[PDB]
């Protein structure tokens, strides 16, 4: 059993998706701004 | 409880971390490729 469970899961699964998208964006940002 | 739980989780937590790292890496590769 988890403590937060709902409060955590409610904003966990969807977070992973958003995080991935943002992560990739960061990579491009750095590259595009190399020189 | 569930069948795996411990085992499954043992190979689920460290995955999220690796995913994030890889995600950012991909983004960079794309950017540096265009520039």
Swiss-Prot record, chains A, B:
Disulfide bonds: none annotated. It comes from the Eukaryota. It is found in: Mitochondrion; Mitochondrion outer membrane. The chain crosses the membrane at residues 11-31. Homodimer. Binds to BCL2. Interacts with BNIP3L and ACAA2. Interacts (via BH3 domain) with SPATA18 (via coiled-coil domains). Interacts with BOK; promotes BOK oligomerization. Interacts with PPTC7; this interaction promotes BNIP3 degradation. (Microbial infection) Interacts with adenovirus E1B 19 kDa protein. Belongs to the NIP3 family. Apoptosis-inducing protein that can overcome BCL2 suppression. May play a role in repartitioning calcium between the two major intracellular calcium stores in association with BCL2. Involved in mitochondrial quality control via its interaction with SPATA18/MIEAP: in response to mitochondrial damage, participates in mitochondrial protein catabolic process (also named MALM) leading to the degradation of damaged proteins inside mitochondria. This is BCL2/adenovirus E1B 19 kDa protein-interacting protein 3. The chain holds residues 154 to 188 of 194 of the full protein.
């Amino acid at each position: 059993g988890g403590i937060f469970s709902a409060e955590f899961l409610k904003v966990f699964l969807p977070s992973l998706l958003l995080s991935h998208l943002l992560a990739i964006g960061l990579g491009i940002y750095i590259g595009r701004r190399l020189t």
